[PDB]
């Protein structure tokens, strides 16, 4: 039944004859059909909360209700397309309306209906048993990734009747006619899924498959597997953007879904301008990073509902890509903005706050957002394996861990890698605290890495113990003195100082240090461990510390150069250098 606004108080508007509509349901208010959301419902008069401007909406204007909740369009035409908090293109809005401002109440499709695509039936015929997730065809979408698999939408099971494949069609065209127990039914290449409901899968699993960060320290200390969860600080000017972009470009995941909550205009504009500038490095040179990825941007002026729930839409799209059987990753910028917007939404819903101005559903929403990710097997005949790696940043107002955002971020994410501004102010590489860095995925990742015989865990824990002993030595150096220690302490301190330069630090500006392969980092840690062990063995061989430090300089200079010279195809070349380190031991048996 068509609704009619009988009351308007501020942003909230109550409309009668809305009994047909449901709770938490989207609606078009006023004669302009402005975007809105239904909050409560009393009989035939439902109370709706408009996310847009309430100005211009008057009495007597028929309000049409969607009768369902907020959703998004998954399918072809989605990739290489920028979107807003409301899941709307800014570029297409500026191209169509040709205006520098965005009107309130305007509406446009998320996916382009003006884009024709060439589709072809892959593994689905007429009469074959298929279900939700089962591949109904294949159509080339991006210029980077392989043809996007168009599958029969969820809750649809039957025998195929009329197939429109192969052929050229748009996103508004039905690519299949399925015959179910409900007789004749229509299915298209494009689908629509609720933003509040995560994408359905066949079976859930734990992620033992490690994701390559491309950074040495990121993959070594606090590694995040594909499907895994990782957290960091959202401090501006702390160089979070560089680490984020380097992570997105060097990611081992197939796709990346970037979702911002809110921020200053300069940051959002800088990201918006610098996004498409990245180029691919797979097949020589494919398309830009913006083509095989999805972007949802919402500024501070955007609605709060388009903030706290934007992460839900982005995660819905990422899980939709994870429903297609491809490993993906979800990046979230300034989650504290979605949390504060959730606080304002808490003030708007009348829900009594819990602590520090946080809503009641705090723990529930955080856990729901953190548990939607992971590596699993999607539903359907396809039986393809997929993953979704959640990566979040929390930027509390006071910076205190007592804030809801901080406790929730530390609690939900099983892996926490801290970014200290002082560490970036130390004239070093990407900022990470050596003391506060921790991850709970160490056991499973270590046991899984034993399959490929790539064992970091031994050298990781060893270098950790070395960094700790060096930390105690540093605490002692500021207490008594630096000249009063033993030989082992000096070797540990020197190894710690050396590890912070040629090992841990990797410049993304260089060729070989931009993305460090598993073999590169493993060989670096192996060579470092070989040098430290050779020094420790030489300490018991009767060699002087000064003479050793002077003679073994070549081994250090050779080990420091293992971070360059591009491609790691010749890792054995490093092994010889390691042997040279052993030769230093032979040099320590002479002088």
């Amino acid at each position: 039944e068509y609704g009619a606004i009988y009351s308007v108080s501020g942003p909230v508007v109550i409309a009668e004859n809305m009994i047909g509509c449901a709770m938490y349901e989207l609606v078009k208010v006023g004669h302009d059909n402005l975007v809105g959301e239904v909050i409560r419902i009393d009989g035939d008069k439902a109370t709706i909360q408009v996310y847009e401007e309430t100005a211009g909406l008057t009495v007597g204007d028929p309000v049409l209700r969607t009768g369902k909740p907020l959703s998004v369009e998954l399918g072809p035409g989605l990739m290489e397309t920028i979107y807003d908090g409301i899941q709307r293109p800014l570029k297409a809005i500026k191209e169509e309306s040709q205006s520098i401002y965005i009107p309130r109440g305007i509406d446009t499709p998320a996916l382009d209906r003006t884009i024709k695509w060439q589709f072809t039936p892959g593994k689905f015929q007429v009469g074959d048993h298929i279900s939700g997730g089962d591949i109904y065809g294949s159509v080339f979408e991006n210029s980077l990734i392989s043809s996007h698999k168009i599958l029969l939408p969820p809750r649809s099971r039957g025998t195929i009747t009329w197939i429109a494949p192969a052929g050229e069609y748009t996103l508004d065209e039905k690519i299949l006619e399925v015959e179910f127990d409900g007789k004749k039914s229509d299915f298209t290449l494009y689908h629509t899924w609720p933003v509040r409901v995560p994408r359905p899968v066949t079976e859930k699993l734990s992620a033992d498959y490690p994701l390559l960060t491309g950074q040495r320290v990121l993959d070594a200390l606090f590694p995040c597997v594909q499907g895994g969860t990782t957290c960091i600080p959202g401090a501006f000017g702390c160089g979070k953007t560089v680490i984020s972009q380097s992570l997105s470009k060097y990611s081992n995941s197939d796709a990346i879904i970037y979702v911002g909550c809110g921020e200053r205009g300069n940051e959002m504009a800088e990201v918006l301008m610098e996004f498409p500038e990245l180029y691919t490095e797979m097949s020589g040179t494919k398309e830009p990073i913006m083509k095989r990825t999805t972007l949802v941007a919402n500024t501070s002026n955007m609605p709060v509902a388009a903030r706290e729930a934007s992460i839900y839409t982005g995660i819905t799209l990422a899980e939709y890509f994870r429903d297609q059987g491809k490993n993906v990753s979800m990046i979230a910028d300034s989650s504290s903005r979605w949390a504060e917007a959730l606080r304002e939404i808490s003030g708007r819903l009348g829900e009594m706050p819990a602590d520090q101005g946080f809503p009641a559903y705090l723990g529930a929403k955080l856990a729901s957002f953190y548990e939607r990710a992971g590596k699993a097997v999607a539903l359907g005949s396809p039986d393809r394996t997929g993953s979704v790696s959640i990566v979040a940043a929390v930027s509390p107002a006071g910076g205190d861990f007592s804030d809801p955002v901080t406790t929730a971020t530390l609690g939900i994410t099983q892996v926490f890698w801290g970014l200290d501004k002082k560490l970036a102010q130390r004239k070093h590489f990407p900022s990470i605290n050596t003391s506060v860095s921790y991850s709970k995925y160490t056991n499973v990742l270590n046991k899984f890495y034993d399959s490929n015989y790539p064992e970091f865990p031994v050298l990781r824990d060893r270098m950790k113990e070395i960094l700790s002993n060096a930390e105690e030595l540093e605490q002692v150096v500021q207490l008594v003195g630096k000249s009063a220690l033993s030989d082992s302490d000096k070797i540990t301190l020197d190894v710690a100082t050396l590890i912070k330069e040629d090992f841990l630090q990797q410049n993304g500006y260089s060729t070989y240090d931009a993305f460090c392969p598993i073999w590169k980092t493993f060989d670096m840690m192996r060579a470092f461990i070989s040098y430290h062990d050779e020094a420790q063995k030489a300490v018991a061989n009767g060699a002087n510390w000064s003479k050793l430090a002077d003679s073994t300089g070549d081994v250090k200079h050779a080990v420091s150069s293992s971070k360059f010279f591009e491609p790691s195809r010749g890792e054995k070349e490093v092994h010889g250098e390691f042997e040279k380190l052993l030769s230093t031991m032979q040099e320590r048996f002479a002088e």
Binding site: G43, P69, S206, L349, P353, E371, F401, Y438
Partner: protein
């Protein structure tokens, strides 16, 4: 069955054209989309009724929804076939097994044990831990909690407890436990699953698992199902019943969520005002019944927010349950085996299992003396850290080395390694032997002459 519905606001429901509704009555809600969601009645006034939806009011039509009201109170299909099979927070099978045949239909609310019918705590048990033996004793059938912090090895240490429980207890017929999770993590779910599988008790134990992905109502109802199940095991089944409940923090925050969703007048720290009694619902259910075989031993696990032991969650936990076993973040980052805080941790009945006739007469006095040496060692540690190493007394350094050794040796044994109570008493006598003759003022002359080799 009334097909008439009136209003919907947030996560709740209101119906009309009905009468004689029951408090906390089971009600089946059939939505417009065909979705069948279970719900409980909130209040009833005249021809109007108000109920709460477990699955939420999301995606539900007002006039197109139908509802069948059973009218009976909260009802669960309890049986003897629950052992070895896994159940979800919603009661539905998560083990992908067939329909479970119910032996008896009983209220999940649980019935308070009559005081005269209540039997006093007795005997003893071996948890495989020296701290679960020496410092704070654990009676069989008694109720003691575990207070941990977020990120700490709560699940792993608890796993050590559940794994070493039935193995060590016989040294004081295998022990049967019950696993319960309310709004818990998938990672913790996998860890607990692998733990219960490794213990091999999965066949002899039952599991009620409510995922965090599931609703809050299911998490709050999981504890009730576990209460009725453990009650049926400790009374009807007449077997030794261990009760393991986890993620009390999630149930607490969810309780605050339900309390705020009704916009009710909140108490301290935003929780419910009936919280003392709400926790006491499943808390006071533990104990022994005179004349009836078996008992229900409650070993709950909760997580203090921001690792704060002064938090209202832990305060209310101590105010509800009697005694608790603390897990400190201070000793968890020290790298030693599982981090029990000697100060905060205490037992409900530590005098029941001590003395001759139970275990030995060398237990309790040694506990008081060791606790004294440890505390004196802590104060002396602060004093030593303040003034200096040459500024502290002899007792200061002696108690310091004694506490350090007590932490490195006595406190550190192992998770999969279950230390017998006798080994605990021997290692304790050897730890106390490190101290001087005049060191222990809490010990008797006979025990002092006996313990020294």
């Amino acid at each position: 069955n009334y097909n008439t519905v009136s209003g919907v606001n947030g996560p709740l429901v209101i119906l009309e054209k009905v009468k004689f509704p029951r408090y906390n009555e089971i009600v089946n809600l059939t939505l417009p989309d065909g979705t069948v969601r279970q719900g409980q009645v909130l209040e009833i006034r005249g021809d109007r009724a108000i109920v709460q939806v477990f699955e939420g009011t999301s995606g539900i039509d007002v006039k197109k929804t139908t509802v069948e009201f059973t009218g009976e109170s909260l009802r669960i299909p309890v049986s003897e076939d629950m052992l070895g099979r896994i159940f979800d927070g919603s009661g539905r099978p998560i083990d992908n097994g067939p329909k479970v045949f119910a032996e008896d239909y009983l209220d999940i609310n649980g019935s308070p044990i009559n005081p005269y019918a209540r039997i006093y705590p007795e005997e003893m048990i071996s948890t495989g831990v020296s701290a679960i033996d020496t410092m704070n004793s654990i009676a069989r059938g008694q109720k003691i909690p575990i207070f941990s912090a977020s990120g700490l090895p709560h699940n792993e240490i608890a796993a050590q407890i559940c794994r070493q429980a039935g193995l060590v207890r016989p040294t004081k017929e295998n022990f049967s436990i019950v696993f319960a999770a309310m709004g818990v993590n998938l990672e913790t779910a996998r860890f607990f699953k692998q733990d219960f599988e490794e213990n091999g008790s999965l066949e002899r134990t039952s599991l009620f698992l409510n995922l965090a992905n599931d609703p809050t109502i299911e998490r709050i109802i999981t504890p009730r199902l576990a209460l009725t199940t453990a009650e049926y095991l400790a009374y009807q089944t007449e077997r030794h019943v261990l009760t393991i409940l986890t993620d009390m923090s999630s149930y607490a925050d969810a309780l605050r969520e339900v309390s705020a969703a009704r916009e009710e007048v909140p108490g301290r720290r935003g929780y419910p005002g009936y919280m003392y009694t709400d926790l006491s619902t499943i808390y006071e259910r533990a104990g022994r019944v005179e004349g009836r075989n078996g008992s229900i031993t409650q070993i709950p696990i909760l997580t203090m927010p921001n690792d704060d032991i002064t938090h209202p969650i832990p305060d209310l936990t101590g105010y509800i349950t009697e005694g608790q076993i603390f897990v400190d973040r201070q000793l968890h980052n020290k790298g030693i085996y599982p981090p029990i805080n000697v100060l905060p941790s205490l037992s409900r009945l530590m005098k029941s299992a001590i003395g001759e006739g139970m275990t030995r007469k060398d237990h309790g006095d040694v506990s008081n003396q060791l606790y004294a040496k440890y505390a004196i060692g802590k104060d002396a540690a602060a004093m030593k850290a303040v003034v200096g190493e040459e500024a502290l007394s002899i007792e200061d350094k002696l108690s310091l080395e004694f506490l350090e050794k007590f932490e490195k040796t006595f406190i550190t044994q192992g998770a999969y390694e279950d230390r017998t109570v006798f080994e605990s008493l021997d290692q304790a006598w050897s730890l106390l032997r490190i101290y001087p003759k005049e060191m222990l003022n809490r010990i008797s002359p006979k025990i002092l002459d006996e313990f020294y080799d």
